[PDB]
Amino acid sequence: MEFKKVAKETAITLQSYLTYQAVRLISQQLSETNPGQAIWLGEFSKRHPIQESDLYLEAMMLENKELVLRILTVRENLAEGVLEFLPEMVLSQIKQSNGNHRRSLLERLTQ
Amino acid sequence: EFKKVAKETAITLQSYLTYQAVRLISQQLSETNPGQAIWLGEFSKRHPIQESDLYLEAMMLENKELVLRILTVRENLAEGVLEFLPEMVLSQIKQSNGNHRRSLLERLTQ
């Protein structure tokens, strides 16, 4: 047991993921509102591993503070709209993927 | 409201848990049979765990016993961990948001 370490790592990754997911939605808007800003964001995203949430944001500060603040807000909105539905959706999907994989391989043995 | 973002996040979470499972199993192996740990190491270089179904399928051509072990461990990990995350990530984001905000606003001064 002790699934606690795995939980800490998972929650971190999720935090970074949702950040990514916000940056994504924002870049979708910019591509339509302020295309230069949009491309700036892409070029920034290439210089910085977005999956380092905090490093990514601390770096962003030093270059475009309005955007950083926007992400922090958009991510948290996403966080609230999405989080409760996750344990159901994943566990259900895992069971299903587990199903198909077992059938697939347990049948592959007869081939 | 953000169903398409829920979909993509769950899919990631699925693969992430698959990843985390391969990581426990990889630790056990490294003790039990070094030979397989090395193998599993480079298997993961040739196949991206992030696309997990494709990963598991490719593994079937090589180590079906393990594919099966992964499926069991990943579901266990799921059980232990999933229900805790929405309190965790939320309260984490909030904290983080706070610290970034403070830190940004204090730079505007200093």
């Binding site: 990514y20 870049s27 977005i50 999956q51 | 992430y16 990843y19």
Partner: peptide, 7 residues
């Protein structure tokens, strides 16, 4: 595309 990857 901005990509997300788990290190």
């Amino acid at each position: 595309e901005i990509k997300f990857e788990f290190d």
